[PDB]
Design a protein around this ligand. Structure first.
Ligand code: ADP
Ligand code: ADP
Ligand code: ADP
Ligand code: MG
Ligand code: MG
Ligand code: MG
Lengths: 533, 527, 55, 526, 48
């Protein structure tokens, strides 16, 4: 009478390190608690008044940022339910590019209110059905909440104004300058054809002069030097070669079979003369810049120097392809001279130093091209990385705007209106699903509450004022960040707008993640074992 | 202790009632785990591997494989369920439940001093009677679209969410009807199942063609061809090494250049053959040429093909050869010795879809494809696996319903009727095997019990209501999972595969008889 | 589908067709087993070990 | 380590202790499988050290999976293996008999009788046992299918396959009959090589059958090849159909431009020449134990020929026996009579999720495949073991047309004959003779014990019955535990099985009685 | 025990919403006084 034996059956057949959680309070409540904890960890980085977090991964690499997706990626999350919510957030990041923190916060609030509903006496199936009905109602309502459209994407000023809000959450101190940079870079890209490519925007990070010295360049910048003596060209005629800048060899096996003295004497001279003829034929086409993806032969470098040809070496094939796109050349596979249509053209190619970094610049004069590069300056590598993340967010926002031009008010207006409308709808729905619908509506309050908490004011007063104002009928009114007291202001006039697609996909993914977490009843965890990767 | 332990001191032995108790305890544990799986009202289970991979499923076989069990009887039952899944693709949870209930009912009489042999004899007699009744009760019908849709819905609703099940029902029924050839066995290899991870779970659909998980490697090839000629080939277009250690010898740079230019003539001849065929079939620019090669294509041949406006795919799957031949209608080629326009497939639209690093090629708008693909879509990885398992189960169910001209009513009605028939037949069995027959009937009665329990209703009261209704009316009434009242499965459309029921009966009876007759469990292979 | 080692199963049920036991080595046993008298695999364990022992 | 004439790890024991230990170890080995004899036997679950499960009631299968330290137990296990390999039946009986004779020998060893006297008495008893078994045997007519089926049924009624006894008997008889061969005046059966048993989990065991041909788990190399040929002409090969290197080092030296392409073209031409040599015979199916090149596949399909590659040598030999073909290594030497005509249908059909190749309509085939479809892998393995026992019994009764009553009748008859023979010995060795004669009663005693009837009353009644003149066919009904004449019950055994069992048991007793000292611990000293 | 657990459960909601615990405690004390008053109001006498 001193020990409790394991119950006969499955409790005894379990492995030595496995775990089995079954039932409501043992599995569902624990999963809800873990997801709420994850949302709590990520909550403080929401909105313009969010706080950066120093995250050090297992490789002793330091990350400082307020991007929810990056923080979740750099964390070693172990709980399976939190893993599922993190997968939902990453999927939202991949599909849209912004709203990961919205997804996490909404999922956490939904799961907390689902736990409350289960405690008051509701069933999991009823809660799931109510959540699905309310999500359908929210997706129906959302198009009616659109306040304005982009209506133009070739304009620098309009694009900068549209993208200011996206990059106001990150780098809240100075977003106008970054908005102008990203607007110029995106307008250079996105030609008359409606297709926009995210990868056409390149980011180069160089230390030393602070982010205020950053600029956009119509071309590409490579952080290396030139092989030859020529370091600057004014009417460049780039000829790109994917093959190494050397005489091609056989593929099976090459053996120089010498049988007489004369062949031994003449072999090297003939080889040098042949490659001289090749290089002179290359140069006679007017080409003056040569870019190669392979190694550069010493004698080839000599004979290119003799003919005043700039040599640039690109190790990565991605850089070669991007340079071909941004100059208009075709990557030749042999040392044949380029034909007229395969000869790339650039306004100016030169070797320059920025800070203490030697770079080669392919510069255009036209405000167009296939690829544009943003040169980022700063006093810290982590700062430039965070600015690059903000630039990525802005570019993704531009891509979303190209896909869909509809916008909804930000700053707490959209979700407050959604909550009010869904609450009104739920009161007209008889049955047990009304509780779940009302909880789904109330879960939208987590966004203005988080914004108010990060802003340093009392969230309850802000929420009450927002409900009042929306009760009069001002659906474009959100909380005012630049105020020491709880206050609200119109968001359409202030230009604080977020994309319709972002809200749509974020709501869909958060609801899906919450429902999928709720559907789980039993957890059978195996022994962790190893597997570091 | 026992005789074996004297010869091998560190041996584990369980003799007489110990072995029976161990086996019955293992079966009861497995049944208790898998009770919650049965029915569309069953509960999803989360499975986490050692590496941390998350899997959500309700399938009996998947759950059994992912269970952390090291028991011999559990291994035997898992093997039986694995065979069940391999042949029929359904009824694994029902298999485990019936085996466990058979063992429990047998133990109920064995604990009273009865020998298991009489129980096994009663089991065999009751199995024969049950098979006869199942033959008598099956509903033979023409497998039109409605019946196949009903069967697919009945499987997928038990496998996934109701709306996703409704979508997958149309998907699977249309796919099976697409590949089906009159009076021929259905080749399930011709339905490619492809997973993409960008849209929602309800965005999965059926493409009347093929989807390839790789695209053209040359950046300058066309991203979309409207009218296309399909060339399915198995010819290597990359550089090939001489089998007899050739090597090159030269005495000057010019000789080296000549040898380099002449070493690619062999592949260039085949490339020229392909280019000449392309020029012959489509001299204009309206039509297009698509080449799918099971072997690789080196960059030189890729550039040569792209110069002629030809999109080419390399390192395709081996099954894709037959899939393209049946879908596009061409002829797979292992050599270009004699290639003619009649060996070229056709496709009304070819385009490439990019998803992150992954590249996907779509071959749609075929004339009358005998091979199609199912594009599984979802936001997660576990969602894709769950949908793939559900799709496999639905495909197996529809194929079984097509193969067997008959279909069996579901919701446990067939088993309630079978139990009543067994009870009626019990007096005709001589000896004490009538106890075995009664145990068999009670064992088959588990499925309506488990369905009612999962739906939340009272077990015994619902079961007696079902039995009373069946006795009064004589119809095939099963458990209604929404109200608990008796319902005619045939009228509603809850259908079960006849082959699934037959295999369930055979396998469960055989394994229960074999386990009951085991009187010793040994492990003496060490030292 | 060649990467999945289709021959694994056939090797599995052709390996069972033969059962003796591996020698259990005594500190000097390890010394004098390799000191005198070919490829030799030696297993180190203290009582996944059983699976590889059966292998 | 002073002196130490022998090594420090050398342990020696001798005397009565060694004999008692050997006999006790043999008795324990017998007791392990004592309960697995008779129609009412119970199965056992054996846990393979590699993780598998063996669930069976065969004596040899149980004993083979048991690892023991006492060398007498090793001798008993080797005895079980020998009995299994020689006749294929009576494996539990020989172990039980050996244990019983060793016990009755221990009885005399406790007294002052030297083991040599016991051994001589055992040998005389064994000679009389053989004589009596030959005397009480009856002939069988091999042309009578019904009686052959009855013999196979009596063999398999003690196994798990006894439920489908008619199906199992028909399968075993058909397989044994068709695998029977006659060439150059030499008769052979060769169940080990041909009559392959292929088990596929799933389906029902009522669907098991023996095919008029060979079935393999293979598919066509190219989809365009036909999966259904009515009357194929099959050609079997060993050499690969692909360009391989020579044995000698054959480095080339290319100087001119066109030699590389010429070499590749000659490789292609060699493949084409081999394919033309194959096609010259106008076949329909080509089977190769090695790989087939893609170009070879194209050249074969150009002539509408189905090709299958990477076939095991045993499977190729089985196909050659079934379809009457000869495996040819060099295609240029292929001739007309090597082409396999006689197969009546070839079909590649899908079972479960795998492709299986069927050649299942051969006329007069000398090889076959038994397709077993069952609940699981372990059940199919047990069914395969039972069917192997059935085929071994059929082969034994075909080679030896003698038949002996079963169900304990033969043991009791031989025991009674030896008792009246020992009644007139008037020596000191008559006691071990009578004891080893009466030791045969352990088989009817085991049958009664497993049936659950009263052992003492039933054995007394049987012994009293066997004292009459024409009562040599009276045994015990293992299902009801009652005396019954076996010319009515119908249980019969081949004489060869009984002879082998008796000889092996007696010789095991002799071998273990000859030993009185045990030394161990020395290294192999290779 | 159940009542204390439930009261702390409902107090956590306000604690997470930037409400100082002193206000919650004052509300709890007012509620307790009114509970005492109400319980004394609905009581009934008993003839021992
Ligand atoms: N100037 C502003 N005033 C008030 N709210 C703002 C302002 N700028 C952005 N927001 C709000 O901040 C939210 C963006 O939060 P953010 O940190 O970007 O999370 P995520 O990256 O997950 O979208 C938007 O919903 C928007 O309403
Ligand atoms: N809508 C329904 N109403 C009532 N019973 C159903 C319904 N759908 C399925 N069933 C029953 O549930 C069983 C299917 O259970 P399932 O979870 O598929 O187990 P298994 O995977 O072992 O087949 C079938 O026997 C069928 O009779
Ligand atoms: N129906 C039966 N009634 C009585 N005895 C039987 C019957 N069938 C078989 N036997 C006896 O059982 C013995 C076979 O036992 P078995 O389990 O096959 O051992 P083994 O595998 O070593 O032959 C035979 O000697 C035979 O005489
Ligand atoms: Mg954002
Ligand atoms: Mg099912
Ligand atoms: Mg036998």
């Amino acid at each position: 009478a001193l020990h409790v034996p394991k119950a006969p059956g499955f409790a005894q057949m379990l492995k030595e390190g496995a775990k089995h959680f079954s039932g409501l309070e043992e599995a569902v409540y624990r999963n809800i608690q873990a997801c709420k904890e994850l949302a709590q960890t990520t909550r403080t980085a929401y909105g313009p008044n969010g706080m950066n977090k120093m995250v050090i991964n297992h490789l002793e690499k330091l990350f400082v940022t307020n991007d929810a997706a990056t923080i979740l990626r750099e964390l070693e999350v172990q709980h399976p339910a939190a893993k599922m919510i993190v997968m939902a957030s990453h999927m939202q990041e991949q599909e849209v590019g912004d709203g990961t923190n919205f997804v996490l916060v909404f999922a956490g609030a939904l799961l907390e209110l689902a736990e409350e509903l289960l405690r008051i006496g509701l069933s999991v199936s009823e809660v799931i059905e109510g959540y699905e009905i309310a999500c359908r109602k929210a997706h129906e309502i959302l198009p009616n909440l659109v306040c304005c459209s982009a209506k133009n994407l070739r304009d620098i000023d309009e694009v900068s104004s549209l993208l200011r809000t996206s990059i106001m959450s990150k780098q809240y101190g100075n977003e106008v300058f970054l908005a102008k940079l990203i607007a110029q870079a995106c307008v250079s890209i996105f030609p008359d054809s409606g297709h926009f490519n995210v990868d056409n925007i390149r980011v180069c990070k160089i230390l030393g002069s602070g982010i205020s010295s950053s600029s956009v360049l119509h071309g590409m910048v490579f952080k290396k030097e030139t092989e030859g003596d020529v370091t600057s060209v004014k009417d460049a005629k780039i000829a790109v070669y994917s093959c190494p800048f050397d005489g091609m060899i056989t593929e099976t096996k090459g053996t120089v079979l010498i049988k007489t003295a004369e062949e031994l004497m003449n072999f090297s001279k003939g080889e040098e003369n042949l490659m001289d003829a090749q290089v002179k034929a290359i140069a006679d086409t007017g080409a003056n810049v040569v870019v190669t993806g392979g190694k550069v032969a010493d004698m080839a470098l000599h004979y290119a120097n003799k003919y005043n040809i700039m040599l640039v070496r690109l190790n990565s094939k991605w850089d070669l392809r991007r340079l071909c796109k941004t100059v208009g050349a075709t990557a030749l596979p042999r040392l044949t001279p380029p034909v007229l249509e395969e000869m790339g053209h650039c306004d100016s190619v030169y070797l320059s130093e920025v800070g203490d970094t030697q770079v080669v610049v392919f510069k255009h004069e036209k405000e167009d091209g296939a690829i544009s590069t943003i040169v980022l300056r700063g006093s810290t590598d982590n700062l430039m990385d965070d600015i690059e993340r903000a630039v990525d967010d802005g570019v993704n926002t531009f891509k979303v705007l190209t896909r869909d031009k509809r916008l909804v008010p930000g700053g707490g207006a959209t979700e407050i209106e959604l909550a009010k409308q869904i609450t009104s709808y739920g009161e007209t729905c008889p049955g047990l699903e009304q509780y779940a619908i009302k909880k789904f509506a109330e879960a939208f309050e987590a966004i203005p509450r988080a914004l108010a908490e990060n802003s340093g004011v009392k969230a309850n007063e802000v929420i009450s004022k927002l409900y009042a104002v929306h009760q009069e009928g001002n659906k474009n009114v959100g909380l005012d960040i630049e105020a020491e007291v709880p206050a609200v202001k119109d968001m359409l006039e202030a230009g604080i707008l977020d994309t319709y697609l972002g809200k749509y996909w974020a709501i869909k993914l958060a609801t899906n993640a919450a429902v999928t977490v709720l559907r789980v009843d039993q957890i059978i965890m195996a022994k962790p074992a190893g597997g570091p990767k | 202790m026992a005789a074996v332990k004297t010869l091998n001191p560190k041996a584990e032995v369980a003799r007489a009632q110990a072995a029976l108790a161990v086996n019955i305890s293992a079966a009861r544990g497995l049944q208790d785990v898998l009770r919650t799986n049965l029915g569309p009202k069953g509960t999803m289970k989360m499975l986490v591997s050692g590496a941390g991979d998350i899997k959500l499923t309700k399938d009996g076989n998947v759950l059994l494989h992912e269970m952390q069990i090291q028991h011999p009887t559990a291994s035997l039952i898992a093997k039986v369920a694995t065979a069940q899944d391999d042949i029929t693709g359904d009824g694994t949870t029902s298999n485990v439940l019936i085996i466990g209930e058979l063992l429990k009912q047998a133990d109920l009489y064995i604990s009273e001093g009865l020998h298991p042999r009489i129980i096994t004899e009663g089991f065999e007699a009751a199995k024969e009677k049950a098979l006869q009744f199942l033959e008598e009760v099956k509903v033979s019908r023409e497998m039109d679209r409605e019946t196949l849709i009903d069967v697919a819905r009945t499987s997928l609703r038990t496998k996934v969410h109701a709306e996703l099940a409704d979508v997958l029902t149309e998907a699977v029924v249309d796919s099976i009807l697409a590949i089906k050839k009159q009076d021929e066995p259905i080749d399930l290899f011709m339905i490619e199942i492809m997973e993409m991870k960008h849209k929602s779970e309800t965005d999965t659909s059926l493409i009347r063609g093929l989807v390839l998980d790789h695209g053209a490697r040359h950046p300058d090839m066309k991203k979309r061809v409207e009218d296309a000629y399909i060339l399915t080939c198995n010819v290597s277009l990359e550089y090939e090494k001489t089998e007899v250690n050739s090597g090159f010898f030269y005495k000057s740079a010019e000789e080296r250049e000549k040898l380099v230019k002449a070493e690619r003539k062999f592949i260039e001849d085949r490339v020229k053959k392909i280019i000449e065929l392309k020029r012959k079939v489509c001299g204009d620019s309206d039509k297009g040429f698509v080449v799918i090669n099971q072997k690789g294509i080196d960059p030189f041949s890729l550039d040569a093909l792209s110069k002629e406006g030809i999109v080419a795919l390399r390192r395709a799957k081996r099954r894709n050869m037959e899939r393209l031949t049946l879908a596009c209608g061409g002829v797979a080629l292992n050599s270009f010795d004699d290639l003619s326009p009649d060996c070229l497939g056709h496709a009304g639209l070819v385009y490439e879809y990019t998803l992150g690093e992954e590249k996907f090629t779509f071959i749609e708008k075929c004339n009358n494809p005998r091979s199609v693909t199912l594009l599984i879509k979802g936001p997660n990885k576990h969602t894709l696996t769950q949908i793939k398992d559900a799709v496999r189960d639905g495909l197996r169910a529809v194929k079984n319903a097509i193969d067997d001209g008959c279909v069996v009513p579901g919701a446990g009605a067939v088993e309630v009727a079978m139990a009543e028939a067994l009870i009626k037949h019990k007096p005709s069995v001589k000896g004490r095997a009538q106890l075995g027959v009664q145990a068999f009937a009670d064992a088959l009665l588990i499925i309506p019990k488990v369905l009612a329990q999962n739906s939340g209703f009272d077990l015994q009261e619902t079961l007696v209501k079902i039995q009373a209704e069946h006795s009064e009316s004589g119809q095939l009434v099963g458990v209604d999972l929404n109200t608990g009242e008796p319902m005619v499965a045939a009228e509603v459309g809850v259908w079960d595969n006849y082959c699934v029921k037959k295999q369930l009966l055979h396998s469960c009876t055989v394994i229960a008889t074999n386990i009951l007759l085991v009187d010793e469990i040994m492990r003496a292979g060490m030292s | 589908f060649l990467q999945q080692y289709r021959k694994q199963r056939m090797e599995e049920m052709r390996q069972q067709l033969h059962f003796k036991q591996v020698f259990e080595i005594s500190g000097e046993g390890f010394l004098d087993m390799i000191d005198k008298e070919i490829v030799i695999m030696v297993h180190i364990y203290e009582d996944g070990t059983e699976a590889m022992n059966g292998c | 380590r002073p002196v130490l004439v022998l090594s420090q790890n050398t342990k020696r024991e001798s005397g009565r202790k060694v004999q008692s230990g050997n006999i006790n170890a043999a008795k324990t080995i017998a007791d392990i499988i004592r309960t697995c004899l008779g129609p009412k036997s119970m199965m056992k679950m054996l846990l393979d050290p590699m993780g598998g499960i063996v669930m069976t009631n065969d004596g040899n299968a149980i004993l083979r999976e048991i690892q023991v330290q006492h060398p007498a137990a090793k001798s008993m296990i080797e005895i079980s293996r020998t009995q299994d390999e020689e006749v294929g039946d009576g494996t539990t009986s020989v172990i039980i008999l050996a244990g019983e004779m060793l016990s009755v020998a221990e009885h005399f060893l406790e007294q002052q009788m030297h083991p040599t006297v016991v051994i001589s008495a055992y040998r005389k008893a064994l000679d009389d046992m053989i004589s009596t078994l030959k005397k009480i045997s009856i002939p069988v007519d091999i042309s009578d299918s019904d009686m052959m089926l009855n013999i196979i049924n009596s063999s398999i009624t003690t196994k798990a396959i006894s439920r489908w006894s008619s199906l199992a008997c028909n399968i075993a008889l058909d397989a044994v009959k068709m695998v029977q061969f006659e060439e150059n005046g030499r008769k052979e059966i060769d169940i080990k090589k041909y009559a392959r048993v292929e088990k596929i989990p799933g389906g029902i065991i009522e669907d098991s059958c023996v095919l008029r041909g060979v079935m393999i788990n293979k598919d066509v190399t190219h989809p365009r090849m036909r999966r259904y040929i009515k009357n194929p002409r099959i050609v079997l090969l060993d050499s690969s159909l692909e360009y391989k290197k020579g044995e000698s080092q054959t480095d080339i030296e290319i100087t001119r431009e066109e030699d590389f392409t010429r070499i590749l073209q000659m490789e292609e031409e060699y493949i084409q020449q081999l394919c033309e040599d194959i096609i010259q015979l106008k076949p329909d199916v080509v089977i190769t134990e090695k790989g087939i090149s893609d170009l070879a596949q194209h050249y074969l399909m150009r002539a509408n020929i189905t090709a299958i590659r990477r076939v095991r040598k045993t499977d190729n030999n089985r196909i050659a026996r079934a379809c009457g073909a000869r495996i040819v290594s060099r295609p240029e030497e292929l001739r007309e009579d090597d082409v396999g005509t006689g197969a009546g249908l070839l079909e590649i059909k899908k079972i479960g999720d795998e492709y299986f190749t069927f050649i299942t309509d051969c006329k007069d085939p000398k090889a076959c495949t038994i397709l077993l479809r069952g609940a699981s892998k372990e059940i199919l393995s047990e069914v395969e073991r039972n069917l192997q026992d059935a085929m071994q019994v059929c082969r034994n009764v075909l080679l030896d047309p003698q038949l002996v009553p079963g169900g304990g009748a033969s043991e009791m008859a031989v025991a009674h004959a030896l008792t009246e023979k020992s009644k007139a010995m008037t020596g000191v060795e008559q006691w071990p003779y009578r004891a080893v004669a009466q030791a045969l009663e352990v088989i009817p005693r085991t049958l009664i014990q497993n049936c659950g009837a009263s052992t003492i009353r039933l054995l007394t009644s049987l012994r009293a019955k066997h004292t009459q003149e024409n009562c040599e066919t009276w045994g015990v009904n293992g299902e009801t535990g009652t005396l019954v004449d076996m010319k009515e019950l119908g249980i019969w055994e081949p004489l060869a099985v009984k002879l082998q069992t008796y000889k092996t048991a007696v010789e095991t007793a002799v071998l273990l009685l000859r030993i009185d000292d045990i030394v161990s611990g020395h290294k192999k000293k290779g």
